[PDB]
Amino acid sequence: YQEDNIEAVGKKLHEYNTQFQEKSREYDRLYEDYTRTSQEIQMKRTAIEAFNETIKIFEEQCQTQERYSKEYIEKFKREGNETEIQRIMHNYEKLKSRISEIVDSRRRLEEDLKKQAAEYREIDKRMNSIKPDLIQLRKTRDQYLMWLTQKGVRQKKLNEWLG
Amino acid sequence: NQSVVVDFLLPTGVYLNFPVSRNANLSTIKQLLWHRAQYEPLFHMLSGPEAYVFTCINQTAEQQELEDEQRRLCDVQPFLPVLRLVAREGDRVKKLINSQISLLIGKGLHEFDSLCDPEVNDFRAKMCQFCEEAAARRQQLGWEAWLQYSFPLQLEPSNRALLVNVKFEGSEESFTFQVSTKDVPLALMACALRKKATVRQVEQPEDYTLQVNGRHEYLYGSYPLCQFQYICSCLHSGLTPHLTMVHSSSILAMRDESSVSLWSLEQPFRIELIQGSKVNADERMKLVVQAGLFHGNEMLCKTVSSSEVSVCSEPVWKQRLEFDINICDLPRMARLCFALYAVIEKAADCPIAWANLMLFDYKDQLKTGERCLYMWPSVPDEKGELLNPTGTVRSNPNTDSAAALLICLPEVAPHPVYYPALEKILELGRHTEEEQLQLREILEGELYEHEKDLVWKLRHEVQEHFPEALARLLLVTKWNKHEDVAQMLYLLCSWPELPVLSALELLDFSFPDCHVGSFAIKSLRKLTDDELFQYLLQLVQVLKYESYLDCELTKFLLDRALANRKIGHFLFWHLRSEMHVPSVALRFGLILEAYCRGSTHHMKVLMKQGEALSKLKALNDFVKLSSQKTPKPQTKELMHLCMRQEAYLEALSHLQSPLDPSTLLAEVCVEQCTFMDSKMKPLWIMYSNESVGIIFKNGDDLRQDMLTLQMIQLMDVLWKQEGLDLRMTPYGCLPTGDRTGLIEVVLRSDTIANIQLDALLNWLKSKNPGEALDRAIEEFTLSCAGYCVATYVLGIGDRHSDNIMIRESGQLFHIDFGHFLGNERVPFILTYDFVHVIQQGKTNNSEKFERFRGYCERAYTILRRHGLLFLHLFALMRAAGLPELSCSKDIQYLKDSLALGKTEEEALKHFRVKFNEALRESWKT
Ligand SMILES: CCn1c(-c2cnc(C)nc2)nc2c(-c3ccc4c(c3)[C@](C)(Cc3ccccc3)C(=O)N4)ncnc21
């Protein structure tokens, strides 16, 4: 209570070791992309916070422009400088349009982070579909190696098969 | 182009937009703004330019008040070219330092606030206070104290008449004269004063200190002169020391530049698994959640599993997982650990992800209510365990995209419950010849269950007679029973102080309890700064095993960083170089912030260094990108033109070296700068001051080499402590960033390959003509022995002529330690061509060869005596996740190579046989 020739099992040890090393390489490629994508997405997230902070600054400017303007709009109206009212207001229109450019650039980044978030998820998935094969090949490689060790196969022949 | 269009927001609400040069400093930009603002509405209401400070959004997404207006806009690096004028006044010192810290640590301080985490908030408040207090205390103390803080003595591990050149600060003329090798530095200062007064005359010698010319290295204190590293080095080389007398004021100028117990709750621990989210798995498979309770690496009870639900993104379970342990028995550091597994339906299981949670929080409260544990992906490792209890308790910071599990700890009492206080633990914790003989042999090493119960019974005997066995006793304690825990902690609190070596073992993941780590640190407080420096890298990696942010080890490292600027220098870089690693970003960021608040001076040194490093990164990326397209000579010239740009040249010049902050990297020797032909195209950057070189590598992880070099350094120190100077070259290597670091250039050196174009012996003759050759050959012999033994013990193979180098002194040294611990046994190796030099070019010179064999054997013998030190240090380095130092088999390599399981006589007999076999092997190859 508890199989073939040595040379046939040893060939299969070599084949399974070659397949384990190759699946390993694939996993390490995906993991490098996983790491890189993780870092990139966090950089994009902090850059979005940076847009938000810049947009926030610009809206303080608008509030400031509106409060601060009044007196000098009303002063130049009584004093006949509708021309100086006109400069202040045109200057403010230029401020507003520049805000819309920055908002548009923020939106492009959010859209790119949406794609790269999906990319991250697909990498994680590809990785999780490899792990069963990678682990199964590691175990088979070891079971063959132990079978040969039990049968008394010397270390030198084992090394030839492991590459 | 140079020019960039910049948005200006004036405080009147007016907006201007115009092109400025990227090189222009903010002061120049402010002048151009003012000149343009006068032709725009509402100018008359602005105060002068000097009443305002520019504000920008910086790369870390924080608003930054730009006080230094000599900074160039390219250096500032605003997120968008948007400068807002804002009132100058406020607490401008705090604003400046807050903003510098964010840029220096590579993480916005706002990212800590955004978390809305009280533990973080309490860490920052408490630690920043304590560091600021220490920094303010430091300022009060005398110039002596400050000199010791900033420039601690560089001493050898540790009579002839040789001469020294002495000068004064701001004086062309020098004074050459002899003093004793064994004279204390006071006596040199007193002499130069008399030499000054004799040739106008007159003040005391204790008003002064001695500086090494062109270095921040200073000679003071009660030690003799030969014990200083500059003097020892000079004396051995035959060169005359060049010193400067610096007055005390000149050093001050640098300084001024409720009613429910936990033990009443006798019902099982349990959790509600609710849902997972953002799972990405094979649709055909089914999902399962394995859960287990842990203390360190031991299970508190048997693991319990959820049911199989079909794979989807948002799987729902809604199960009560009940564990075989009552709430009253949970230890303080009890760890709830999860692994999400995809499995083929019941009719290789994929480990998807894992997450750990402390069951009590940082204030000793048993957690209640919901938690969202953002998970880390499981990596398929060799020892394929279900759960990952050694993993960090911190949540994955990629909350946007990472998988998560929702759980709920049920409310167990009406009022909140704490882990009992120390007083109530010591309350509960109180209370033959054959078994004494059986305890003895048991403490001479995996203990089995029958032995565990014996040690437990005779725990009082272990404390009385075997205090060095504390670690064994802590592992035999049953941490899933609050009575046994109570009894172990009782003993622990009256346990005698253990030596450093023992303390180091107690810092490992096996000993999570907060009382143990506190006892360990309490034993590490004996450390001198020089010894602590030897272990700094390991103490830092051990922070990744901590459960809470506010811990004893962190406080200890900050204390020592605040008292010694060199320790703080290297603490900063060991932390900074991992700020890209998401499992430690938060913890290291918090330590770095607190460190910075206690050291605003060094912060200025660190800022200058981080900028040099940033220029080099960009410079190295250009060189990589050019190498693929164009040949080397052209690429080399294009590197130089990029370097001579004002903003490059300034940021690359006049900094303290990160490799050694006492070394000043003054003027960049641009024509001598180049890049090496290796795969990552590392930069060779030469300097001249009062010649030094650095190598900037980006693309490789340099941590292996640093560890290897740290250990060779340690070996050299251990050898030198027994009076054996093996003339090693344990040069600087320092990870600075994401796969980035610096390597010290060893001057006047060349590769064995280059010299071999016998030739080795001639080279030495041509570099040491006539009567200097016996020195050179003896330097070669001593260093060949040391590196033969070092590389054998550490298991460093692939030792070839491209990665072995020779100094013109004769000293031989190894480089490029990418591989160690046999990553088969690496035999002890002698090289025939090295034997030929050792034998003075002769076939058979037994006298010399026997001396070399002696040097090898005494070297090996000394390491064996400190074998436990190397095992402990390597054991703690497993925290670093180096692929070649991941398991106890890696540690076994060191046990075998140092032959610790054998007596000294047996070990040395085996070393001899291996030595002899290597001499036999030498000829054959
Ligand atoms: C101790 C640090 N260090 C390293 C080093 C590198 N990388 C790692 C991971 N560790 C150590 N190499 C070093 C070298 C060095 C290595 C190879 C070599 C030369 C010098 C010359 C002689 C000159 C040379 C040619 C072209 C470009 C640059 C230099 C040559 O022809 N080949 N000299 C000093 N110190 C070094």
Q: Which of A52, A62, A87 sits opposite B41 (nearest CB)?
A: A87
Hey, what are B451's tokens?
A: 């032995």
Which of B712, B736, B743, B814 for a ligand 1 pocket mutation test, highest count of atoms within 8 Å of Cβ? B743
B267, burial (CB in 10 Å: exposed 0-12, middle 13-18, buried 19+): exposed
Residue B546 CA to residue B885 CA, distance in Å, equals 20
CATH 3.40.50.1980 correct for B268-409: no
B540: which residues sit within 8 A by CB, 6+ positions away? B557, B571, B574, B575
Q: Backbone breaks in chain B (C–N > 2.5 Å) follow which residues?
A: 158, 199, 201, 257, 347, 431, 444, 690, 757, 823
- The sheet with strand B174-180 has its strands ordered as B174-180, B161-168, B242-247, B208-212, B218-219
Hey, what are B824's tokens?
A: 């088969």
Is residue B700 lining ligand 1, measured as CB closer than 6 Å? no
Distance from CA of B828 to the nearest CA of A (A): 20
The rounded Å distance from CA B761 to ligand 1 centre is 21
B629: which residues sit within 8 A by CB, 6+ positions away? none
Q: Residue type for A3, please?
A: E
Hey, what are B796's tokens?
A: 């460093």
B171: which residues sit within 8 A by CB, 6+ positions away? none
Which of B751, B802, B808 for a ligand 1 pocket mutation test, highest count of atoms within 8 Å of Cβ? B751
CA dist A101 → A92, A105, B156, B309, B587 (Å): 15, 6, 63, 48, 38
Residue B29 CA to residue B20 CA, distance in Å, equals 7
Q: Any alpha helices (H) in B433-513, and if so which ranges?
A: 433-442, 449-457, 459-465, 470-476, 482-493, 500-506
* Domains identified in chain A, total number: 1
Q: Which of B282, B384, B400 sits opposite A128 (nearest CB)?
A: B282
Cβ-based neighbour number of residue B313 at 10 Å:
12
User: Taking a C-beta distance cutoff of 8 angstroms, is the pair B550, B119 a contact?
Assistant: yes
Which residue's alpha carbon is nearest to atom 3 within ligand 1? B745
Closest chain A CA to residue B348: A132
Q: To 5 degrees, how large is the angle CA B395–CA B400–CA B404?
A: 50
The number of angstroms, rounded, from the C-alpha of B842 to the middle of its chain's C-alpha atoms is 46
Residue B881 CA to residue B402 CA, distance in Å, equals 22
Q: Which residues of B touch A69 (CB under 8 A)?
A: 13
Q: To 5 degrees, how large is the angle CA B291–CA B292–CA B293?
A: 140
Tell whether B343 lies on the interface with A, counting CB pairs under 8 A: no
Residue B647 CA to residue B669 CA, distance in Å, equals 16
Cβ-based neighbour number of residue A131 at 10 Å:
23
The rounded Å distance from CA B751 to ligand 1 centre is 8
Hey, what are B7's tokens?
A: 């948005």
Residue B485 CA to residue B815 CA, distance in Å, equals 49
B426: which residues sit within 8 A by CB, 6+ positions away? B489, B490, B493
Q: Residue type for A121, please?
A: R
Q: Which residues of A touch B384 (CB under 8 A)?
A: 135, 138
Hey, what are B483's tokens?
A: 């009575």
B89: which residues sit within 8 A by CB, 6+ positions away? none
B464: which residues sit within 8 A by CB, 6+ positions away? none
Is residue B463 lining ligand 1, measured as CB closer than 6 Å? no
User: Taking a C-beta distance cutoff of 8 angstroms, is the pair B537, B529 a contact?
Assistant: no
Interface of B with A in 394-423 (CB under 8 A): 397-398, 400-401, 403
A136: which residues sit within 8 A by CB, 6+ positions away? B348
Tell whether B342 lies on the interface with A, counting CB pairs under 8 A: yes
DSSP track, B203-237: --GGGEEEEETTBS-EE-SSS-GGGBHHHHHHHHH
Residue A55 CA to residue A96 CA, distance in Å, equals 11
Residue B412 CA to residue B444 CA, distance in Å, equals 45
Which of B635, B673, B750 for a ligand 1 pocket mutation test, highest count of atoms within 8 Å of Cβ? B750
Of A19, A57, A112, A113, which to mutate for an interface test with B (greatest number of B Cβ within 10 Å)? A57
Q: Which of A31, A49, A64 sits opposite B61 (nearest CB)?
A: A49
Residue B561 CA to residue B198 CA, distance in Å, equals 44
The number of angstroms, rounded, from the C-alpha of B922 to the middle of its chain's C-alpha atoms is 39
CA dist B795 → B703, B819, B825, B854, B869 (Å): 16, 8, 7, 21, 17
B723: left (phi over 0), alpha (psi -120 to 50) or beta: left
Beta-bridged to residue B83, according to DSSP, are B8
Tell whether B350 lies on the interface with A, counting CB pairs under 8 A: yes
Q: Any alpha helices (H) in B344-458, and if so which ranges?
A: 422-429, 433-442, 449-457
User: Taking a C-beta distance cutoff of 8 angstroms, is the pair B400, B453 a contact?
Assistant: no
Hey, what are B794's tokens?
A: 């550490």
The rounded Å distance from CA B746 to ligand 1 centre is 8
Q: Backbone breaks in chain A (C–N > 2.5 Å) follow which residues?
A: 2
Beta-bridged to residue B15, according to DSSP, are B9
Residue B407 CA to residue B416 CA, distance in Å, equals 19
Which residue's alpha carbon is nearest to atom 36 within ligand 1? B745
User: Taking a C-beta distance cutoff of 8 angstroms, is the pair B374, B402 a contact?
Assistant: yes
- Per DSSP bridges, beta strands B376-377 and B286-295 are unpaired
Is residue B745 lining ligand 1, measured as CB closer than 6 Å? yes
User: Taking a C-beta distance cutoff of 8 angstroms, is the pair B664, B215 a contact?
Assistant: yes
B800: which residues sit within 8 A by CB, 6+ positions away? B753
User: Taking a C-beta distance cutoff of 8 angstroms, is the pair B273, B291 a contact?
Assistant: yes
Q: To 5 degrees, how large is the angle CA B348–CA B349–CA B353?
A: 135
The rounded Å distance from CA A57 to ligand 1 centre is 50
Distance from CA of B84 to the nearest CA of A (A): 8
User: Taking a C-beta distance cutoff of 8 angstroms, is the pair B707, B537 a contact?
Assistant: yes
Distance from CA of B21 to the nearest CA of A (A): 21
Q: How many helices and strands in chain B, by DSSP H and E?
A: 33, 32
B28, burial (CB in 10 Å: exposed 0-12, middle 13-18, buried 19+): middle
Hey, what are B741's tokens?
A: 């670091």
The rounded Å distance from CA B803 to ligand 1 centre is 9
- For B79, phi and psi rounded to 5 degrees? -55, -50
- For B739, phi and psi rounded to 5 degrees? 40, 50
Which range of residues forms the domain containing residue A28? 1-163
User: Taking a C-beta distance cutoff of 8 angstroms, is the pair B334, B358 a contact?
Assistant: yes
Q: Which residues of A touch B315 (CB under 8 A)?
A: none
Is residue B676 lining ligand 1, measured as CB closer than 6 Å? yes
Containing B340, the helix (H) or strand (E) segment is strand B335-343
B561: which residues sit within 8 A by CB, 6+ positions away? B567, B568, B571, B572, B595, B598, B599
Hey, what are A110's tokens?
A: 């959010």
Per CATH, the homologous superfamily of domain B422-605 is: Phosphatidylinositol 3-kinase, accessory domain (PIK) (1.25.40.70)
The rounded Å distance from CA B678 to ligand 1 centre is 10
Hey, what are B498's tokens?
A: 């253990």
